[PDB]
Amino acid sequence: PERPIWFPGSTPPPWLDGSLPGDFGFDPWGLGSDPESLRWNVQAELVHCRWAMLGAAGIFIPELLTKIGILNTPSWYTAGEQEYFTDTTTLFIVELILIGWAEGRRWADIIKPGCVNTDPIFPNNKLTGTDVGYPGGLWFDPLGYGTGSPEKLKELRTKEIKNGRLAMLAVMGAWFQAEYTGTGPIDNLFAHLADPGHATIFR
Amino acid sequence: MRDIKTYLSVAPVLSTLWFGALAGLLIEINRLFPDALSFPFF
Amino acid sequence: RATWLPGLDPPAYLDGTLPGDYGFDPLGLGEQPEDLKWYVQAELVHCRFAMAGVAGILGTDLIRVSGIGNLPVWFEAGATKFDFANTTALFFVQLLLMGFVETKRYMDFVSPGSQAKEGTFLGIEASLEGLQPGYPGGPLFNPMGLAKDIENANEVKLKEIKNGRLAMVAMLGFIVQASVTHAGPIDNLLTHLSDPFNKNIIHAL
Amino acid sequence: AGLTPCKESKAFAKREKQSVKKLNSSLKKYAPDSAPALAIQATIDKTKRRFENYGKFGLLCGSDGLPHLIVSGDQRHWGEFITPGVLFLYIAGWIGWVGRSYLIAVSGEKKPAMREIIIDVELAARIIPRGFIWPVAAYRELINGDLVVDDADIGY
Numbered sequence: 367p368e369r370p371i372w373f374p375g376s377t378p379p380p381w382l383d384g385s386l387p388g389d390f391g392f393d394p395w396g397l398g399s400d401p402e403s404l405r406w407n408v409q410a411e412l413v414h415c416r417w418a419m420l421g422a423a424g425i426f427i428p429e430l431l432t433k434i435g436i437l438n439t440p441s442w443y444t445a446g447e448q449e450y451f452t453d454t455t456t457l458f459i460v461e462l463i464l465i466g467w468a469e470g471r472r473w474a475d476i477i478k479p480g481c482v483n484t485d486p487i488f489p490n491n492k493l494t495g496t497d498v499g500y501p502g503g504l505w506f507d508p509l510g511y512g513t514g515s516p517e518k519l520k521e522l523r524t525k526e527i528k529n530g531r532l533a534m535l536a537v538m539g540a541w542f543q544a545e546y547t548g549t550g551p552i553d554n555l556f557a558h559l560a561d562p563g564h565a566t567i568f569r
Numbered sequence: 570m571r572d573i574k575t576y577l578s579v580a581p582v583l584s585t586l587w588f589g590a591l592a593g594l595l596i597e598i599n600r601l602f603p604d605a606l607s608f609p610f611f
Numbered sequence: 612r613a614t615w616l617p618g619l620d621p622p623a624y625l626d627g628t629l630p631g632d633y634g635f636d637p638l639g640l641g642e643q644p645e646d647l648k649w650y651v652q653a654e655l656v657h658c659r660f661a662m663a664g665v666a667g668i669l670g671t672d673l674i675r676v677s678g679i680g681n682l683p684v685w686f687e688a689g690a691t692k693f694d695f696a697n698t699t700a701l702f703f704v705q706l707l708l709m710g711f712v713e714t715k716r717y718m719d720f721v722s723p724g725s726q727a728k729e730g731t732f733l734g735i736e737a738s739l740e741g742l743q744p745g746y747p748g749g750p751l752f753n754p755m756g757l758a759k760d761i762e763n764a765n766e767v768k769l770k771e772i773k774n775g776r777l778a779m780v781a782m783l784g785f786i787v788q789a790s791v792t793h794a795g796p797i798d799n800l801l802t803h804l805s806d807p808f809n810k811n812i813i814h815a816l
Numbered sequence: 817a818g819l820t821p822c823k824e825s826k827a828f829a830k831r832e833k834q835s836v837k838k839l840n841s842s843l844k845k846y847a848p849d850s851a852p853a854l855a856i857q858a859t860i861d862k863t864k865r866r867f868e869n870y871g872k873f874g875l876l877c878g879s880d881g882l883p884h885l886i887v888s889g890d891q892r893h894w895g896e897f898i899t900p901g902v903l904f905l906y907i908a909g910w911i912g913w914v915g916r917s918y919l920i921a922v923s924g925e926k927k928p929a930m931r932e933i934i935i936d937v938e939l940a941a942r943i944i945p946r947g948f949i950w951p952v953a954a955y956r957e958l959i960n961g962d963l964v965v966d967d968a969d970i971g972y
């Protein structure tokens with residue numbers, strides 16, 4: 367209730383009550399006004415939090431380490447065009463299959479919780495998670511780290527979304543910067559460090 | 570949220586969405602296989 | 612119950628007595644008994660023709676390429692000729708006996724057992740029924756009478772189903788494979804095994 | 817019926833010659849590299865490959881240099897009418913068979929009026945693929961005698 371709100375002193379929507387991790391009462395348009403869409407959208411925000419987190423790691427870390435002389439990674443922007451040990455198309459096809467397997471099973475768990483967590487081949491490999499979107503198990507919790515008391519996971523999960531939100535902005539940061547500036551993200555950092563009051567969007 | 574989906578499901582709104590998709594599909598096919606006076610596959 | 616789609620529940624009518632009941636009929640194609648009862652045989656007759664059919668396509672091209680024997684491609688077999696075989700008459704001939712055997716099977720499902728009480732002698736006993744519509748084993752159709760009709764029928768038919776279901780798919784492969792590659796099926800395998808990441812349907816197009 | 821093949825008809829190869837010359841007439845007025853000169857050139861190639869495909873797939877041309885269709889069923893020409901025709905009839909039933917399933921599906925409700933002006937999208941999604949196998953499904957209905965009714969027509 368008295369949890370911090372995005373807009374202090376405003377009245378948060380009723381369907382947001384602070385239970386979920388990262389609920390700062392932010393939903394002006396009420397996309398999660400009804401419970402069901404909220405449930406789906408919770409997943410939507412969750413996975414988007416993880417992909418960008420790798421993408422932020424995928425863009426910034428190599429470009430940083432190649433800006434200094436340690437490695438050779440090219441720009442993420444033209445990363446797709448590069449020619450690797452085979453054609454791009456088949457790798458994308460191979461990516462279509464394998465991801466579709468996890469994006470298939472994950473789909474089953476979403477529409478029907480708890481009906482997917484046992485290994486189809488070696489049935490003693492059952493997964494341990496109970497919350498939808500938190501698979502648990504030895505593959506995805508090699509030491510646990512998710513099986514704890516509340517007010518800790520709520521802290522931890524909020525430490526998972528609040529970072530993910532930080533990623534999704536950053537990668538779209540690297541997105542638009544590469545388009546209307548001619549260089550990588552780190553250059554856009556440095557040219558902003560030499561003359562902070564001059565070198566900005568306003569060139 | 571429910572009321573928005575219901576409105577989007579009323580007949581006229583589906584029609585433009587459905588036909589619009591249909592128009593896009595036919596235009597694409599004619600862009601890739603133009604003139605198309607016969608069906609010369611078999 | 613280990614359906615085809617782990618999360619999805621199987622439909623209510625595919626209870627499971629039919630061998631190979633992997634709860635799979637999405638389009639609502641079997642929600643009437645008389646429908647479903649007549650559909651099972653189709654899968655049984657199709658699969659059996661599709662089990663031998665692939666082997667005839669497969670084995671013949673395998674022996675020819677290696678060099679043990681020589682035969683035309685199954686694609687090229689339709690125009691083959693040796694002697695005294697007008698493709699006209701053969702069609703009529705094959706239509707005759709197949710017409711004979713197909714119908715008497717059809718009369719069996721239409722009327723069980725109304726096929727082995729007649730005048731013509733010496734054979735009026737075996738062609739009664741196998742006691743299971745799609746399995747007409749008799750002491751002529753199972754000359755090595757080696758069935759108990761109940762127990763293995765759950766555990767052995769399930770082999771013949773999953774055998775056939777695979778075989779029907781495989782034949783569909785060659786038809787499309789020959790339709791695009793213009794070549795033999797093993798040739799398709801031999802070509803792809805050469806450079807798999809460059810010999811693929813993406814390159815075939 | 818005397819329709820010579822288009823790959824042979826000199827009249828066909830005349831129409832191809834004029835329409836190319838007519839376009840090349842409209843081209844020698846712009847810059848040799850401006851946007852109009854490219855769009856004109858694009859249509860020029862599209863034309864030549866149009867005529868070639870008509871002189872390749874066995875279309876028969878009359879004395880007008882124009883293709884003529886043989887819809888008589890001579891299976892030397894199956895892709896002109898018969899093959900596209902069967903392609904339509906497959907589609908047309910799919911539209912027909914799906915729509916029938918829906919009306920029957922929503923028929924048993926409190927007021928079928930509301931579920932047709934406000935279409936149920938989910939129910940129409942689990943029915944949209946059942947039109948993939950309409951020839952099989954319908955032909956069984958006809959045999960089983962549920963494709964039609966007999967003398968109970970209005971009301972119920």
Ligand code: CLA
Nearest residue numbers: 535536538539540542543546547554555557558565566567
């Ligand atoms: C983590 C987010 C993040 C960060 C650190 C930066 C940082 C920077 N951006 Mg950038 N950007 C971002 C997101 C971000 N951006 C997003 C989401 C977009 C898409 C709209 C852009 C689009 C963009 C363009 C088109 C340009 C920059 C440029 C720059 C540099 C100079 C600042 C400027 O003029 O842009 C001002 C930035 C904006 C108008 C968009 C910022 C949008 C974010 C979401 C606002 C909130 C930032 C966030 C709260 C900061 C977190 C605090 C702390 C962690 C630092 C600077 C290094 C410029 C450059 O190259 O300088 C030479 C430039 O031309 N950015």
Ligand code: CLA
Nearest residue numbers: 911912913914915916917918919935936939940941943944
């Ligand atoms: C499911 C849709 C459907 C079906 C199966 C039929 C079936 C039939 N109609 Mg028909 N009809 C329909 C809709 C339909 N109608 C609608 C919406 C109209 C108003 C324009 C008509 C107007 C109409 C006339 C005027 C005539 C028929 C006739 C006939 C019969 C002969 C077929 C024919 O001539 O087609 C006629 C085809 C049309 C007129 C084309 C319009 C049909 C549209 C394009 C289909 C609509 C499908 C629906 C919107 C999709 C629902 C999807 C769902 C998932 C939401 C046949 C019983 C004829 C008859 O009596 O013959 C015995 C006849 O004279 N109908």
Ligand SMILES: CC(/C=C/C=C(C)/C=C/[C@@]12O[C@]1(C)C[C@@H](O)CC2(C)C)=C\C=C\C=C(C)\C=C\C=C(C)\C=C\[C@@]12O[C@]1(C)C[C@@H](O)CC2(C)C
Nearest residue numbers: 393394395396397414417418421424425442445534535537
């Ligand atoms: C920002 C974003 C979504 C933002 C959503 C917003 C703001 C919505 C806000 C609202 O809805 C709420 C909250 C409440 C409503 O009442 C109000 C509004 C305001 C309407 C998603 C980004 C999501 C960003 C993602 C998922 C980034 C993924 C990165 C990936 C996949 C990896 C890519 C790479 O592989 C390539 C492409 C090339 C390699 O070289 C490099 C790497 C980086 C490795």
Ligand SMILES: CC(/C=C/C=C(C)/C=C/[C@@]12O[C@]1(C)C[C@@H](O)CC2(C)C)=C\C=C\C=C(C)\C=C\C=C(C)\C=C\[C@@]12O[C@]1(C)C[C@@H](O)CC2(C)C
Nearest residue numbers: 636637638640657660661664667668685688779780782783
């Ligand atoms: C019979 C068959 C093939 C038999 C082959 C034969 C005789 C080959 C003969 C020859 O080679 C030889 C021997 C020698 C050559 O010299 C001569 C020829 C003639 C060349 C294949 C069947 C092939 C049949 C196939 C592949 C059928 C596939 C059906 C599918 C996938 C349907 C799925 C669904 O219906 C369900 C299951 C449930 C629904 O709810 C959902 C949907 C999807 C609608």
Ligand SMILES: CC1=C[C@H](O)CC(C)(C)[C@H]1/C=C/C(C)=C/C=C/C(C)=C/C=C/C=C(C)/C=C/C=C(C)/C=C/C1=C(C)C[C@H](O)CC1(C)C
Nearest residue numbers: 419422423507508509511532533536539540551552554555
């Ligand atoms: C924009 C821009 C622009 C300019 O140009 C420049 C700049 C400024 C630089 C930029 C910025 C950026 C940013 C902000 C970024 C951020 C990022 C992030 C956050 C990431 C994360 C990210 C995140 C991440 C990775 C995460 C990760 C995680 C992990 C791995 C985990 C793991 C695990 C698990 C499962 C569990 C188990 O039991 C154990 C473990 C093993 C532990």
Ligand SMILES: CC1=C(/C=C/C(C)=C/C=C/C(C)=C\C=C\C=C(C)\C=C\C=C(C)\C=C\C2=C(C)CCCC2(C)C)C(C)(C)CCC1
Nearest residue numbers: 887888889898908909910911912913914916950954955963
């Ligand atoms: C071969 C040919 C030809 C001819 C043709 C003809 C002559 C035909 C006839 C036809 C006819 C004479 C027909 C009749 C019919 C009748 C009826 C009676 C029908 C019915 C149908 C129905 C009933 C259907 C229904 C349905 C379905 C199934 C699908 C859709 C939906 C519905 C429900 C509608 C020509 C020369 C052109 C050309 C060449 C080819």
